[PDB]
Amino acid sequence: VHLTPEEKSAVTALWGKVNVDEVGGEALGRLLVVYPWTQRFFESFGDLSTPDAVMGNPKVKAHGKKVLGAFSDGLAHLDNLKGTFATLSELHCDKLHVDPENFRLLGNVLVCVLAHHFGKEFTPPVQAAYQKVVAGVANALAHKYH
Amino acid sequence: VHLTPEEKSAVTALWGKVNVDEVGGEALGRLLVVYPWTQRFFESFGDLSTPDAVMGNPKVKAHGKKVLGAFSDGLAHLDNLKGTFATLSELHCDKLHVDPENFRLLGNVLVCVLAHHFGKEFTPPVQAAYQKVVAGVANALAHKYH
Amino acid sequence: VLSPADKTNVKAAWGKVGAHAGEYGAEALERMFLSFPTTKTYFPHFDLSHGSAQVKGHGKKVADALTNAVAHVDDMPNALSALSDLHAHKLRVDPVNFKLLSHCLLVTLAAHLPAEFTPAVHASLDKFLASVSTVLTSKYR
Amino acid sequence: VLSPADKTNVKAAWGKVGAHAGEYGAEALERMFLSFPTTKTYFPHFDLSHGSAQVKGHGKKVADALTNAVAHVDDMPNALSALSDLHAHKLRVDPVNFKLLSHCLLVTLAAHLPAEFTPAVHASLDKFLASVSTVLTSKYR
Ligand code: HEM
Ligand code: HEM
Ligand code: HEM
Ligand code: HEM
């Protein structure tokens, strides 16, 4: 999106200390506990009964690695979000049938986690930049939804 | 916004048969009735307690006449809705303090007014072309919000 | 939050509909799939083209479920308990889409019932449709 | 609606807030005014700058009403009746902004309660806040 040169540097600075694989499994698992109606796609994941079962499922964790990976590689093309996600956008609509709202629920649970992860370092100005970034990433994924 | 050849011809042909002073009066009244909290920005308009009042109130009808007017002006400039309402956007934000959300409510009440007036003629494809224009014009007004 | 004037309205306009409910419901979806493509995701096993029997068959159910709610407008949570469970644990439709249907419904009622679609009734229904959306999703978590 | 567990977790996460309530409510506000500028349309009479006596004082009221909602979560409609009327008839805030203020309130609680903010607690706080959002807007029409 349109972030200033100071807001972009901020994003990158903080994401330089993010363990992409851990946050991935914490983001995707928390999305399935607070908003269970998302679980509708992961029947083939197994036990999703309790929050611990959901948070200790090797599949949910593994899928989180993917999501937040494709997410992290998109931080290098903040100036061309649609381009980079034009293909995953197409795929999520026609073959996955994933309601675009999900990328908004995930984008907010991603913010609450980075908040719980960095504490006082996750400052109000820093949060906004991230809010603009997640919205921008959600918007791009829902760009080719016919 | 972007509309196909069939859509644009549907939106126009229809807008040619609209009394901009009757639909605008109606639309603004129902907004105030169906969503009361929007009555906040209009203390100096008089009597709004009953729907019979709201709809027969001349100041409310006078306004709706001007709003829906400035709306038709952008219907001429679809390819550039953002630059067409650049001045109004600023106005609504800075001096008026009107939560952009209220452009989203009016836009939906305006499609109900069109469906009430034209009946069958307002076929699903037609309405579809109209949900686009409104949401577009909505973003265009909310575009310069800080 | 429905005032007496509200139940009388809702019942009044829903009484005029009558037999046409099936036809009406069917159109509310077609307007929904065309005006809000993201609601097509919940139906990848359907044929969403104009005249689709599946869509007309679904509209029928949806409309009967509303007629059922209008009858038991005083005790909805129970008349709709079975539907609530179905949407909460099986279908899992995101709460947002309920707004798109309600909207698409009211539109279908105006382009069909103009004399009874006054700004008063208009406000009673929207509330009504809201009230049914509050029930059908009450058990999502 | 809530569950016996959600209450215990709410009474938990909050019980730890203690005397940082009015201050945590103040941070949640700055955040909302930054990540969502559309909200500053309801405070054209405030001095919205870091440290403001108006923004702090307000954060104290907001939290205190929450401390009161938690004490009486077994009966929230009754306890927030005075605010329900205030928001419905005077302030008149669009029911959408309650969700934004809710997000900023969870971001704050998480950045301040590393030990407590677990997946199950996070889930409960999000419900509670929405449950508070529903009571304050219940009288809107
Ligand atoms: C920032 C957003 C997200 C990104 C970057 C993203 C990226 C991806 C990627 C890389 C794939 C693999 C595509 C392939 O098979 O070639 C995928 C698949 C998938 N995603 Fe997303 N995704 C996102 C959010 C989500 C969310 C929120 C949901 C839904 C509630 C979702 C559900 C799925 C599902 C069901 C699949 C297939 C599962 C599998 O085969 O393992 N995604 N996504
Ligand atoms: C499709 C959207 C809208 C358009 C195109 C539009 C257009 C306009 C225009 C042309 C002005 C007249 C300024 C003047 O000459 O005094 C105006 C003023 C104003 N608008 Fe809007 N407007 C829109 C939506 C709304 C909505 C939804 C609200 C609030 C619920 C709103 C509230 C007002 C008010 C109160 C004024 C200022 C009246 C005064 O103090 O003189 N407008 N608008
Ligand atoms: C006024 C609100 C709604 C009502 C009262 C309603 C009612 C119903 C009813 C009666 C059924 C049939 C259950 C059966 O098979 O026995 C059903 C199924 C279903 N509904 Fe809803 N529904 C509502 C909203 C939604 C929304 C917004 C969506 C769309 C995004 C949705 C998606 C579905 C799906 C996919 C099914 C199963 C379709 C099938 O039979 O294969 N519903 N609903
Ligand atoms: C969890 C939600 C909320 C709670 C618990 C809450 C609580 C309160 C409280 C306790 C008051 C003080 C009234 C008094 O002085 O007697 C109030 C006033 C106010 N609230 Fe709400 N509120 C909430 C959400 C909102 C939202 C989302 C907004 C708008 C974006 C908002 C805007 C206002 C404003 C403008 C005031 C008046 C400020 C003044 O004194 O001039 N409130 N609210």
Query: Which are the contacts of A119, defined by CB distance < 8 A and separation ≥ 6?
Result: D111, D112, D114
Q: Is B123 helix (H, G, I), strand (E, B) or coil?
A: coil
Phi and psi at C132, nearest 5°, equal -80, -30
DSSP string, A52-114: HHHHT-HHHHHHHHHHHHHHHTTTT-GGGHHHHHHHHHHHHHHTS---TTHHHHHHHHHHHHH
CB B20 within 8 A of CB B14: no
Six-digit token string for B115: 């469906």
CA separation, residue D106 to residues A10, B36, B123, D133 (Å): 22, 30, 44, 14
Atom of ligand 3 nearest to the CA of C97: 27
Q: Contacts of residue C141 in chain A, CB cutoff 8 Å?
A: 34-37
Phi and psi at A82, nearest 5°, equal -60, -50
DSSP string, chain D: ---HHHHHHHHHHHHTTTT-HHHHHHHHHHHHHHH-GGGGGS-TTS--STT-HHHHHHHHHHHHHHHHHHHTGGGHHHHTHHHHHHIIIII---TTHHHHHHHHHHHHHHHH-TTT--HHHHHHHHHHHHHHHHHHTTT--
**Does the CB atom of residue D113 touch ligand 4 within 6 A?**
no
CB B131 within 8 A of CB B40: no
Six-digit token string for D28: 């949640």
Six-digit token string for B102: 């209220």
Residue with tokens 């061309």: A80
Amino acid at B139: N
How many pairs of residues across A and D have Cβ atoms under 8 Å apart? 56
Q: Contacts of residue A51 in chain D, CB cutoff 8 Å?
A: 118-120, 123
Query: Which are the contacts of A15, defined by CB distance < 8 A and separation ≥ 6?
Result: A72, A75
CB B27 within 8 A of CB B109: yes
DSSP string, D100-126: HHHHHHHHHHHHH-TTT--HHHHHHHH
* Alpha-carbon gap: D141 to the closest alpha carbon of chain B (Å): 7
Six-digit token string for B118: 């034209």
What is the rounded CA–CA span in Å between residue C52 and residue A119?
A: 54
A36 to chain C, any CB pair closer than 8 A? The answer is: yes
Q: Is C52 helix (H, G, I), strand (E, B) or coil?
A: coil
What is the rounded CA–CA span in Å between residue B60 and residue B26?
A: 9
Give the number of other Cβ atoms within 10 Å of residue B120's Cβ.
Answer: 8
**Does the CB atom of residue A102 touch ligand 1 within 6 A?**
yes
Q: Which of B55, B116, B125 sits opposite C117 (nearest CB)?
A: B116
Chains touching B (at least 3 CB pairs under 8 A) are C, D
CA separation, residue D55 to residues B68, C35, C51, D31, D59 (Å): 37, 41, 57, 12, 6
Residue C30, classified by CB atoms within 10 Å of its CB into exposed (0-12), middle (13-18) or buried (19+), is buried
Give me the domain span that covers residue D31: 1-141
The 10 Å CB-count burial string (b at 16+, else e) for A34-59 is bbbbbbbebeebeebeebeebbebee
What is the rounded CA–CA span in Å between residue C48 and residue A16?
A: 46
How many degrees, rounded to 5, is the angle at CA C139 between CA C135 and CA C141?
140
What was the elucidation method? neutron
Centroid of ligand 1 to alpha carbon of A67 (angstroms) = 6
CA separation, residue B132 to residues A39, A56, B16, B109, B111 (Å): 31, 43, 18, 14, 11
CA separation, residue B96 to residues B88, B118, B134, D49, D136 (Å): 10, 33, 21, 21, 25
* Alpha-carbon gap: C34 to the closest alpha carbon of chain B (Å): 6
CA atoms within 13 A on the CB side of C103: 22
User: CB A99 to CB C92 under 8 A?
Assistant: no
CA separation, residue B26 to residues B44, B46, B63, B126 (Å): 19, 17, 11, 20
Find the closest chain C residue to B124 by CA distance.
Answer: C31
CA separation, residue B141 to residues B42, B70, B99 (Å): 19, 11, 11
Atom of ligand 3 nearest to the CA of C94: 30
Amino acid at A139: N
Q: What is the CATH number of the domain that holds C133?
A: 1.10.490.10
Length of chain D: 141
CA separation, residue A129 to residues A135, B94, D111 (Å): 10, 23, 17
Q: Which of C122, C112, C128 is nearest to C17 (CA)?
A: C112
CA separation, residue A90 to residues A65, A100, B98 (Å): 21, 12, 36
What's the number of domains chain C is made of? Answer: 1
Give me the domain span that covers residue B51: 1-146
Residue with tokens 């306004």: B63
Centroid of ligand 2 to alpha carbon of B67 (angstroms) = 6
Atom of ligand 3 nearest to the CA of C39: 30
What's the number of domains chain A is made of? Answer: 1
Largest pairwise CA distance in chain D: 41
Amino acid at B45: F
CA A121 to chain centre: 20
**Does the CB atom of residue C39 touch ligand 3 within 6 A?**
yes
Q: Which of D38, D88, D140 sits opposite B99 (nearest CB)?
A: D38
Q: What is the CATH number of the domain that holds B42?
A: 1.10.490.10
What is the rounded CA–CA span in Å between residue A107 and residue C126?
A: 30
Q: Contacts of residue D117 in chain A, CB cutoff 8 Å?
A: 116
What is the rounded CA–CA span in Å between residue A54 and residue A40?
A: 13
**Ramachandran sector of residue A136 (left: φ over 0; alpha: ψ -120 to 50; beta: rest):** alpha
Six-digit token string for C35: 């005006």
B98 to chain D, any CB pair closer than 8 A? The answer is: yes
H or E segment and range at residue B63: helix B58-75
Residue with tokens 């909290």: B37
